[PDB]
Design an enzyme around this catalytic site. Structure first.
Site, PDB file in Angstrom:
ATOM      1  N   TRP A  62       0.866  -1.162   0.000  1.00  0.00           N
ATOM      2  CA  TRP A  62       0.000   0.000   0.000  1.00  0.00           C
ATOM      3  C   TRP A  62       0.902   1.210   0.000  1.00  0.00           C
ATOM      4  O   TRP A  62       1.539   1.486   0.997  1.00  0.00           O
ATOM      5  CB  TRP A  62      -0.988   0.186   1.164  1.00  0.00           C
ATOM      6  CG  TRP A  62      -1.883   1.395   0.948  1.00  0.00           C
ATOM      7  CD1 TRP A  62      -1.741   2.599   1.540  1.00  0.00           C
ATOM      8  CD2 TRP A  62      -3.032   1.520   0.081  1.00  0.00           C
ATOM      9  NE1 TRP A  62      -2.718   3.461   1.117  1.00  0.00           N
ATOM     10  CE2 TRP A  62      -3.527   2.837   0.223  1.00  0.00           C
ATOM     11  CE3 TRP A  62      -3.695   0.649  -0.790  1.00  0.00           C
ATOM     12  CZ2 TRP A  62      -4.653   3.300  -0.478  1.00  0.00           C
ATOM     13  CZ3 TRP A  62      -4.802   1.106  -1.484  1.00  0.00           C
ATOM     14  CH2 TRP A  62      -5.272   2.416  -1.338  1.00  0.00           C
ATOM     15  N   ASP A  89       8.980   3.054   3.243  1.00  0.00           N
ATOM     16  CA  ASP A  89       7.773   3.843   3.442  1.00  0.00           C
ATOM     17  C   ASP A  89       7.320   3.796   4.915  1.00  0.00           C
ATOM     18  O   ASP A  89       6.534   2.932   5.289  1.00  0.00           O
ATOM     19  CB  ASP A  89       6.687   3.341   2.444  1.00  0.00           C
ATOM     20  CG  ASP A  89       5.377   4.092   2.465  1.00  0.00           C
ATOM     21  OD1 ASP A  89       5.163   4.960   3.277  1.00  0.00           O
ATOM     22  OD2 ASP A  89       4.491   3.723   1.557  1.00  0.00           O
ATOM     23  N   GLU A 126       7.460  -1.407   2.982  1.00  0.00           N
ATOM     24  CA  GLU A 126       6.884  -0.974   4.226  1.00  0.00           C
ATOM     25  C   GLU A 126       7.568  -1.894   5.263  1.00  0.00           C
ATOM     26  O   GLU A 126       7.701  -3.101   5.051  1.00  0.00           O
ATOM     27  CB  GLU A 126       5.361  -1.214   4.232  1.00  0.00           C
ATOM     28  CG  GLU A 126       4.503  -0.220   3.440  1.00  0.00           C
ATOM     29  CD  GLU A 126       3.143  -0.815   3.304  1.00  0.00           C
ATOM     30  OE1 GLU A 126       2.382  -0.597   4.350  1.00  0.00           O
ATOM     31  OE2 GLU A 126       2.811  -1.494   2.356  1.00  0.00           O
ATOM     32  N   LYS A 183       1.517   9.978   7.636  1.00  0.00           N
ATOM     33  CA  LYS A 183       0.409   9.911   8.596  1.00  0.00           C
ATOM     34  C   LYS A 183       0.714  10.368  10.011  1.00  0.00           C
ATOM     35  O   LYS A 183       0.068  11.261  10.555  1.00  0.00           O
ATOM     36  CB  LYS A 183      -0.169   8.492   8.584  1.00  0.00           C
ATOM     37  CG  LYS A 183      -0.914   8.098   7.312  1.00  0.00           C
ATOM     38  CD  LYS A 183      -1.705   6.824   7.602  1.00  0.00           C
ATOM     39  CE  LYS A 183      -2.497   6.298   6.405  1.00  0.00           C
ATOM     40  NZ  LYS A 183      -1.549   5.695   5.423  1.00  0.00           N
ATOM     41  N   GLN A 243       3.108   4.591   8.484  1.00  0.00           N
ATOM     42  CA  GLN A 243       2.312   4.115   9.597  1.00  0.00           C
ATOM     43  C   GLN A 243       3.119   3.687  10.773  1.00  0.00           C
ATOM     44  O   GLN A 243       2.589   3.570  11.877  1.00  0.00           O
ATOM     45  CB  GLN A 243       1.458   2.925   9.144  1.00  0.00           C
ATOM     46  CG  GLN A 243       0.250   3.460   8.393  1.00  0.00           C
ATOM     47  CD  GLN A 243      -0.808   2.420   8.272  1.00  0.00           C
ATOM     48  OE1 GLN A 243      -1.122   1.749   9.250  1.00  0.00           O
ATOM     49  NE2 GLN A 243      -1.348   2.259   7.078  1.00  0.00           N
ATOM     50  N   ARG A 245      -6.849  -4.194  12.287  1.00  0.00           N
ATOM     51  CA  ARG A 245      -5.682  -3.376  12.470  1.00  0.00           C
ATOM     52  C   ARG A 245      -5.952  -2.594  13.731  1.00  0.00           C
ATOM     53  O   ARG A 245      -6.915  -1.843  13.792  1.00  0.00           O
ATOM     54  CB  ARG A 245      -5.372  -2.483  11.261  1.00  0.00           C
ATOM     55  CG  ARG A 245      -5.034  -3.316  10.020  1.00  0.00           C
ATOM     56  CD  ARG A 245      -4.453  -2.498   8.890  1.00  0.00           C
ATOM     57  NE  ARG A 245      -5.350  -1.423   8.475  1.00  0.00           N
ATOM     58  CZ  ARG A 245      -5.085  -0.561   7.491  1.00  0.00           C
ATOM     59  NH1 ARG A 245      -3.939  -0.666   6.836  1.00  0.00           N
ATOM     60  NH2 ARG A 245      -5.916   0.410   7.143  1.00  0.00           N
TER      61      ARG A 245
HETATM   62  C1  PLP Z   1      -1.575   5.777   4.098  1.00  0.00           C
HETATM   63  C2  PLP Z   1      -0.368   5.337   3.425  1.00  0.00           C
HETATM   64  C3  PLP Z   1       0.196   6.026   2.320  1.00  0.00           C
HETATM   65  C4  PLP Z   1      -0.534   7.170   1.600  1.00  0.00           C
HETATM   66  O1  PLP Z   1      -0.774   8.313   2.368  1.00  0.00           O
HETATM   67  P1  PLP Z   1      -1.989   9.161   1.877  1.00  0.00           P
HETATM   68  O2  PLP Z   1      -1.947  10.415   2.649  1.00  0.00           O
HETATM   69  O3  PLP Z   1      -3.210   8.374   2.120  1.00  0.00           O
HETATM   70  O4  PLP Z   1      -1.829   9.480   0.369  1.00  0.00           O
HETATM   71  C5  PLP Z   1       1.362   5.662   1.757  1.00  0.00           C
HETATM   72  N1  PLP Z   1       2.032   4.644   2.293  1.00  0.00           N
HETATM   73  C6  PLP Z   1       1.624   3.927   3.349  1.00  0.00           C
HETATM   74  C7  PLP Z   1       2.511   2.784   3.813  1.00  0.00           C
HETATM   75  C8  PLP Z   1       0.390   4.282   3.924  1.00  0.00           C
HETATM   76  O5  PLP Z   1       0.030   3.539   4.989  1.00  0.00           O
END
Ligand code: PLP
Ligand code: PLP
Ligand code: PLP
Ligand code: PLP
Ligand code: K
Ligand code: K
Ligand code: K
Ligand code: K
Ligand code: NA
Ligand code: NA
Ligand code: NA
Ligand code: NA
Lengths: 431, 431, 431, 431
Positions: free
Chosen positions: A136, A241, A208, A270, A244, A404
């Site tokens: 994601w 990434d 991730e 986030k 989260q 989650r």
């Molecule tokens: C939520 C998320 C994103 C994207 O962030 P947005 O603000 O929703 O565009 C990218 N990478 C990861 C791993 C995320 O959990």
């Protein structure tokens, strides 16, 4: 009531549906770990919103800061530098590992991965990107081409050079090397394949540390380091990434600090914004220099804007002072154990994984088969709601539904115990 | 001083360069049409920031609203609806033309164009996108593939199905139909070509009503309507990118209202947020319904967040009350005339175009040849700065440098006269 | 001498190098299983040329037929039908399995795979093609995108929608399912991945029944049938590339007849032409009808040309009469055993595989490790040459060099014994 | 009769339809400029087959050569060089202009363009290819992506980096530069656009000197030279596709010799083979050297095969001796004039263009409007057939149907006069 017909009328008539299904309530206000409906009911927010509210909703320092700034420095022309920007950039440099020196301040997660993916393409001279089959990374163009957990069908071709490798998943092992699950061998087997397909233009790998949407899949031990080495061999950059996971949620400032592997580009989102639209990318000076000589460009309306930068600095200051990274481990340990007890009680819980305050509960029909529980998740989720516990379940192919759980870093002992109960009751009344 | 060595040290060491060159000053505070440096100097902000501050910096109502909300409703889980969201969606439905019914609330311009481009691809079953050769739609994946004014080189292949047509430019006509500039014929000639290349999958056309980065290029009369018809014939959607033009800047709420052509998808951004990260897409119910049946998805962290929605509603309320759309025409008329006077005085000004408070001055060496003035722009821009006037020049191929002038909608008679002078002086002292 | 300086001068000055390295001799004439150099030396042709001369060089019936036709019907306008075309089409229909009804007569292998791949894309409405990581389907555009054994680097992006899966290789097993090599599970694991990446547009799968360039890799038992089922589930067509295997070489008319799995499109080439440029595709009427309604198009200069069609019919007639398909099994059994004896004698031979007269010998350093023999292959190949035996070795990653042995279908007991010796001597004198 | 029910039954049941519609006759034999049906009727072959039979059908020297070789040297392993190959390569070097040094001998037109396009991609490091909107370069992968006259729809995405520019067409001018048709300005205008879209990877431009399928569109004066210069500026190679024009058809050995512009890669096909499957590419040593150092690869079954090479050498020898290049101008002048007379007689003929023996007649409704004659072409074509004249009409968008007339280079005065009559009668009886 949440039933206000004018509200729902207007909503049915003027909102675009973008996935899922709107809750059947009206959120009137939010504070700490709770959200309140039109009726004054307090729903315990166990997902920190959209996995972001690391400091809870309406944290009094966030309010101060937003206040100091709205009336002082709001938005500036993209070439005009200011204080909150330069301080945030700096702060990020010092708290990320060595090797991570320069930051770019943006607005969303996907935007940050786009900027990272474009810099690697620039720096390498290449375009192929590899990601996990259950990733994601966002909805925008390139972030979407590296996303495989969902939204891949019916929207046209993906970007050229897109490949994916399986993520190492311990719960449901699939690759076996003499008796056991050899995730490293899986990795090698995977990379062999990529190599066989690459047109000779591998530019980067985005990963991730913990696959959130992919069902809270933790990268097993020694994986990252092995991954990093696969990238090094091929001349590829490694983009982590940490949208989260960054900012204390897993018990370290950044998950990459557990493994001890520092990435080429690190992306934040986030939790950096704690609810607001702030995002960034942090890279090494070498790469940045290189990217600059080649004419790197990522100019947006809100890059380097005073307000957001300013909010971020505070999130960081608070986490730092209140030692929230540590609280994440302590409260995280408390939630974990509670979940395991639940596991003891109900056969439907097949697994509990994650780190810190980023936990996952995999619902299953029975532990022996580990057969996915068809819609029992939706039940539990329905029942949680009624009781006032806000959960979220992700459901993928060949997997059971995964809850989650990611409460705020500022959760209290009581709120944790509380959700733990509601969860118990919701489960109990849904078999 | 703006010269604070610690500041610049940290900046040189920890900021990623993303294009352009940082101003050599420290913006300490901002208010109304001015920004202030570390020395207390007031720079008149003639570009409204990054073309966004439609209500100026730190407009007292924006401050109230940000305040009411930071402490009440900040960020929510993406499935949780709230009041400011539903009201903004609605408001947008009512102020955009008929035919524009449902909105999706996001964060950036590029994000909004991504969402639009993905919905059209979904709805049509196709993937090819056509845009103008001098467009600007954002840095992210698909927005970037439809951008042709810049950043196209050295970053890998573009998305498949990307085509561009020339934009109709009156100042420097290139297509001639018997004696004169036949922009419609140019259009037909262009489309013939596309048709000859299309793989049979034309999905949409994105257009800026006025090409901002492309040098404030106004779409000539009857063009849009002709464009819309070209799309209709082919089954393509028309996406209008009103990021710089929407919300009163050109003298109508939305530029599409002048032409009288309502698009299939309308995208909003910069001015909707007035400095903050808010963006949206507005579409017809038919398309939305269709997109919903097919499983459209555009789920982000900040879609439908209470705070931003709330700020946007206010921008809209203020514009509405203070009749700022009208002020844009009046003050716009005042700025225009002043510029023309300047034109009378200096041979270097070759053209003055635009609408409302979205004007453009094309610097040229001499009017006869209309030969671009090599770096005279940079001079004028340098000189403006020294005098305290913040301008911005865009420079493209086969064009002279263009000053983008776009003061706030709340500018005063005095501030306008003032910049008009500074401009005069800066020009005067740069030949 | 083969050393004629004028010859080599002209060759060095006017030939484009397209891969490999020209033999240092001049082939003056060819007959049966031998080629003759400028010196009159007879080299035993163990590769049937470029794996094509199924009936040997200058087979007297081929000569008759070429003769009858050159002076009677040579080349016709693409819309003009003739006798040899209609008879060949028909013959093909009757000798291929049931389910294979209509043929398209072309010129090369790659051309035939292009035509197949375009018809499947047409018929399905999709574009993604999956092939094996060690395939060989030709040099042209799409055939090249499905080729993974070589030429993938430095020539630009591949076609969109290109994926590859590993081929099942028994000699060097890599996927293990509880104790042993589970090639079917490998298949499932592979397909899961594809599914995870597909944009929802899987159109076909092309496979070689026996990977020739990939080192004579035979598809293990029950694989094809499983493969076919994977395609069926997804709506994909199965294209079998029988260029090196069709026309009796493996002991059946077509290899697909052993497995008993009949493909959606079958492609023929090398052996159909027996040395000439003839190729075809055979499909089911349903697909053809479908392809016709949708406007399928594959018009070339030489589609349906009288001469080639005519030669092909003869190859087929001869194979049929002389019962060459059976000879392939008998002589094939003779060559095999001989090779195994060799294996008994030298540790360098690590494996002998293949079917009929399409055999492979994998050179290795030692059987225990199965460590590839670095350049011992080149030695053996050099030594063969000197002795008058023409061999060919393919060498891939993580594999030992493989000798592709594929004598004519008309080889004699003596010629087989002979090469078997030369091979022995060449090996002997190269350690 | 041509009506043999068994024949047509088998044809309906076992042939794949690949475009167009089979003639309703059976070609039994062919000789010189005629083909004969099952009834013994001689149809005058005015299209030289599929535009290939430059020496007519069954030219006695072709028969000798095919004969000498079928029984002596047929097909060889791709690394084995022989005499006919080396002589053909050489001959080609000497008869093409200076600057064209090395040849690659293949089988089809499309194959030759694939090889050219792959070498340019290799040599430049780039992948974008530009061609004309009404080109024809073949059915295979890359040749198909550069083809725009037909087959572009319903078969999946084209290769990335595909762009097209309009071809300069005098008959129906579309670009005007002050009063008249400025094809050079059209060119510049076109290239500006490409430049605006290119991702910075322009590798080559392929062009037909005379667009055959595009309706016999001759590149106007000074165009090629201008084109070549556009390529030079950008670092692009120029590939000239002389498949229908090479080998004397337009009155020079190669059309590129008229313009005096020698290309970077020259491709030959149809006429080189005179009916057989032979094709080649000729390039400069510099490029070839370069391509070799970088590992260029284009290995096929039939590259460098003795038979074909041998036939080609003869075509060339005959053209040379009989001075057929000159006959093409003389007989070509005779056909031309005849056509113009026809033009005098019937208003439906709107234009007669071409060169040498590669002429085109554009059917139109009336000369004033130049309105395309809807299906009058099919009539004329039907009527020609009945009378025994084999013609071919191409029909594109915004164009009238064009008869492609291209008799053999060995046509006689009588055969020309004859077709000229039949044509007259067919036209006469179709209004
Ligand atoms: C939520 C998320 C994103 C994207 O962030 P947005 O603000 O929703 O565009 C990218 N990478 C990861 C791993 C995320 O959990
Ligand atoms: C600024 C701009 C965008 C992009 O908005 P960002 O917030 O910078 O991503 C898109 N379209 C137009 C027309 C713009 O002017
Ligand atoms: C040789 C080969 C081809 C290509 O045939 P060419 O005539 O060389 O283009 C295609 N497929 C397979 C399996 C081959 O062995
Ligand atoms: C016919 C033609 C080709 C293709 O040759 P084929 O043998 O049909 O593949 C390529 N280019 C041109 C200009 C042609 O006329
Ligand atoms: K900014
Ligand atoms: K949200
Ligand atoms: K033909
Ligand atoms: K060969
Ligand atoms: Na750091
Ligand atoms: Na509306
Ligand atoms: Na059959
Ligand atoms: Na030459």
């Amino acid at each position: 009531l949440n039933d206000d017909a004018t509200f729902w009328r207007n909503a049915r008539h003027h909102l675009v549906r973008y996935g899922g299904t709107f809750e059947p309530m009206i959120i009137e206000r939010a504070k700490g770990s709770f959200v309140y409906d039109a009726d004054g009911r307090a729903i315990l927010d166990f997902t920190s919103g959209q996995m972001s509210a690391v400091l809870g909703h309406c944290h009094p320092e966030i309010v101060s800061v937003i206040g100091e700034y709205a009336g002082k420095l709001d938005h500036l022309f993209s070439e005009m530098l200011s204080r909150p920007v330069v301080d945030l950039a700096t702060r990020l440099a010092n708290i990320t590992p060595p090797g991570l020196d320069r930051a770019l301040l943006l607005s969303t997660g996907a935007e940050s991965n786009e900027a990272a993916i474009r810099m690697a393409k620039l720096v390498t001279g290449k375009y192929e990107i590899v990601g996990f089959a259950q990733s994601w990374h966002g909805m925008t163009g390139a972030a979407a081409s590296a996303t495989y957990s969902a939204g891949r069908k019916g929207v046209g071709p993906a970007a050229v050079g897109s490949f994916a490798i399986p993520a190492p998943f311990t719960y449901r092992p699939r690759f076996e090397r003499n008796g056991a699950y050899d995730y490293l061998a899986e990795l090698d087997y995977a990379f062999d394949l990529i190599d066989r397909q690459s047109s000779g233009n591998l530019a980067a790998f985005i990963a991730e540390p913990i696959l959130s949407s992919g069902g809270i899949i933790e990268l097993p031990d020694g994986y990252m380091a092995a991954l990093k080495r696969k990238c090094e061999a091929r001349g590829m950059l490694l983009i982590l990434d940490e949208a989260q996971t960054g900012v204390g949620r897993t018990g370290t400032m950044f998950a990459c600090q557990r493994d001890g592997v520092t990435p080429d580009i690190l992306t934040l989102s986030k939790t950096l914004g704690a609810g607001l639209p702030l995002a960034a990318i942090v890279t090494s000076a070498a790469i940045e220099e290189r990217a600059h000589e080649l004419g790197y460009l990522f100019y947006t309306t809100h890059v380097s804007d005073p307000l957001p930068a300013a909010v971020g600095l505070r999130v960081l200051d608070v986490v730092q002072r209140d030692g929230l990274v540590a609280r994440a481990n302590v409260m995280g340990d408390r939630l974990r154990r509670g979940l395991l007890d639940l596991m003891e009680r109900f056969d439907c819980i097949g697994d509990v994984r994650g780190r810190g305050l980023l936990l996952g509960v995999e619902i299953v029909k029975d532990r022996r088969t580990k057969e996915p529980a068809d819609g029992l998740g939706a039940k539990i989720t329905r029942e949680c709601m009624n009781l006032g516990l806000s959960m979220n379940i992700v459901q993928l192919p060949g997997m059971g539904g995964v809850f989650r759980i990611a409460p705020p870093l500022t959760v209290s002992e009581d709120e944790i115990d509380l959700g733990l109960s509601l969860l118990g009751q919701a489960i109990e009344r849904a078999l």
